[PDB]
């Protein structure tokens, strides 16, 4: 049967969507169907922050971060525990916590 | 078997029919 109403993607009034590649497997998957997330991560990872602050040529340094979108396939996503499988009643929470 | 490969087997068989019947005709 139709397991979903949108078939695991978002295609209405298109008929076609240009593809996207994953990053582990690099599988050609569409965009509306993908597991796009967003990595916004301080470059320093919260451990070396004290050392870099004290050793900075300039204090009051912003200490910028990596900003980038992360497209994942269903397989590698589920395997890397990004998402996980959901009950037949809670598949429909289209928003996150 | 898988339907696609069943199709491929059928096609190869079919074109072989083609060739043999060309040989006889």
């Amino acid at each position: 049967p139709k397991k979903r109403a949108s078939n695991g993607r978002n295609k209405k009034g298109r008929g076609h969507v240009k593809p996207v590649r994953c990053v582990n497997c690099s599988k050609s998957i569409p965009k509306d169907k993908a597991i796009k997330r967003m990595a916004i991560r301080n470059i320093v990872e919260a451990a070396a922050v004290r050392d870099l602050s004290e050793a900075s040529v300039y204090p009051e340094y912003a200490l910028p971060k990596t900003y980038n979108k992360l497209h994942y396939c269903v397989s590698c996503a589920i395997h890397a525990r990004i998402v996980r499988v959901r009950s037949r009643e809670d598949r429909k929470n289209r928003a996150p916590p | 078997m898988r339907a696609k490969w069943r199709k491929k087997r059928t096609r190869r068989l079919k074109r072989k029919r083609r060739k043999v019947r060309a040989r006889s005709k």
Partner: protein, 226 residues
């Protein structure tokens, strides 16, 4: 891998630190920190002419470094090695660029990006390709989430931007460009042109590439470095 290599030399010392000499590079008149840095180069034998072998270079340094200003932090200037006078060598403009972290911060969805490009000549014989980035924004008193434009607004924004670019650069020489881009008055010119179109925040500038300069004119460079 410390001990894996099957051959370091299929073909079958002096310390380069001692073989290298120091040099000290200064900015032009358009930036308050003239003295900006140093560099190294092998000792100028008659075989090599370290002067020219070093002349063929460029350096990116931050405008916060050159003006003390963390608001100017997000812009970097490439300054070309153009003159050398006995280890107090001098530069001139080569090209601007933002920081990718800044760009990746300002880019976000539920808004509309706009980008324009122009490939225009200046008053002083250079020919430069400048770009311009502008964003949309939810108005105050607005309630919608995205504030998407309607593409005719965008094409018009493109036209007015590009003609502003040509107008300015056609008449402003190189140093004048630097002097009016360090404050970025151009962005406020855009916003004052367009505030009857869209609120239009985050209207910064984008890279600029000398496509062909005139002759060096060491006299002009020294005039800058008076």
């Amino acid at each position: 891998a410390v001990g894996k290599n099957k051959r370091l030399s299929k073909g079958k010392v002096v310390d380069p630190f001692t073989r290298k000499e120091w040099f000290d590079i200064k900015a032009p008149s358009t930036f308050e920190n003239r003295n900006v840095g140093k560099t190294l180069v092998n000792k100028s034998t008659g075989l090599k002419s370290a002067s020219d072998a070093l002349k063929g270079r460029v350096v990116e340094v931050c405008l916060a470094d050159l003006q003390g200003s963390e608001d100017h932090s997000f812009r970097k200037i490439k300054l070309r090695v153009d003159e050398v006078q006995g280890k107090n060598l001098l530069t001139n403009f080569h090209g601007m660029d933002f920081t990718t972290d800044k760009l990746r911060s300002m880019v976000r969805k539920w808004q509309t990006l706009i980008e324009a490009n122009v490939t225009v000549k200046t008053s002083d014989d250079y020919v430069l390709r400048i770009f311009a980035i502008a964003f949309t924004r939810k108005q105050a008193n607005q309630v919608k989430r995205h504030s998407y434009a309607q593409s005719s607004h965008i094409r018009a924004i493109r036209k007015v931007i590009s003609e502003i670019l040509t107008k300015e650069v056609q008449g402003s020489t190189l140093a004048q460009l630097t002097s009016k881009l360090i404050p970025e008055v151009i962005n406020k010119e855009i916003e004052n042109a367009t505030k009857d179109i869209f609120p239009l925040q985050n209207i910064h500038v984008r890279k600029v590439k000398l496509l062909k300069q005139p002759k060096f004119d060491v006299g002009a460079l020294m005039a800058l470095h008076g």
